[PDB]
């Protein structure tokens, strides 16, 4: 039933976030994602309505990418790394890439969620203000925002409850 797509630059932590939420596990070892594929999780909404969530991981590197999979999606998650300025500045282009290729019926209502990942990292290395993120998140149509750590299992549960809630609303 529920199709969710996760987009964002290489290295931001998409695959890690998916393993955290679906499998409650994490691994330090970078293994580059190639082509799109999904894992599944049975969910229960805040309402105690039940659903199977199909979570799609995608490649961040141009050369490992795929097009069709974007269609169907009931929610789109946009992920940047709080330690990498460029990843953040690319969020709107990931959003627009999705809308161009996704063939969704109402772009101004279609649910996106943004995640800022790697908050567990040392302050010295962190670059993207919460404030900036909240600005970008509003300017893109008041999209929900969540700061997360796949590594330390921080807030990934919260983030994905909204992603679930927003996706079920869009499906039917
Ligand atoms: C354990 C060694 C250590 O201390 N490393 C530094 C800790 C940095 N913290 C941290 N926090 C996170 O929440 C987190 N998520 C993911 N990473 C790391 O970044 C690399 C990329 O992970 P992927 O999940 O492979 O990223 P991606 O899917 O977007 N890449 P693709 O688009 O597929 O190329 C990886 O090293 C992961 O461990 C985090 N690090
Ligand atoms: Cl524009
Ligand atoms: Mg990956």
Residue numbers in the entry: 8 to 73, 76 to 181
Published text:
Extending the labelling experiments to other GTPases, placing a cysteine at the position equivalent to E35 in Rab1b led to covalent interaction with aGTP for all those tested (Rab5A, Rab6A, Rab7A, Rab8A, Ypt7, HRas and Cdc42), albeit at variable rates, but substitution of cysteine at positions corresponding to L125 in Rab1b only led to covalent reaction in the case of Rab7A. Using this Ypt7 variant, we were able to produce a covalently linked aGTP adduct that was stable enough to allow crystallization within 12 h at 4 °C and allowed structure determination. Structural comparison of these adducts with Ypt7:GDP and Ypt7:GppNHp demonstrates that the covalent linker provides sufficient flexibility to allow the covalently locked proteins to adopt similar conformations of the nucleotide-binding pocket and in particular of the switch I region of Ypt7Q35C–aGDP, Ypt7Q35C–aGppNHp and Ypt7Q35C,K38I,Q68L–aGTP compared with the non-covalently nucleotide-bound proteins. In conclusion, the structures of Ypt7 modified with aGDP, aGTP or aGppNHp are very similar to the non-covalent Ypt7:nucleotide complexes, demonstrating that the structural properties of GTPases are maintained in covalently modified proteins.
Proteins of the Ras superfamily of small GTPases regulate a variety of cellular processes such as intracellular transport, cell shape and motility, as well as differentiation and growth.
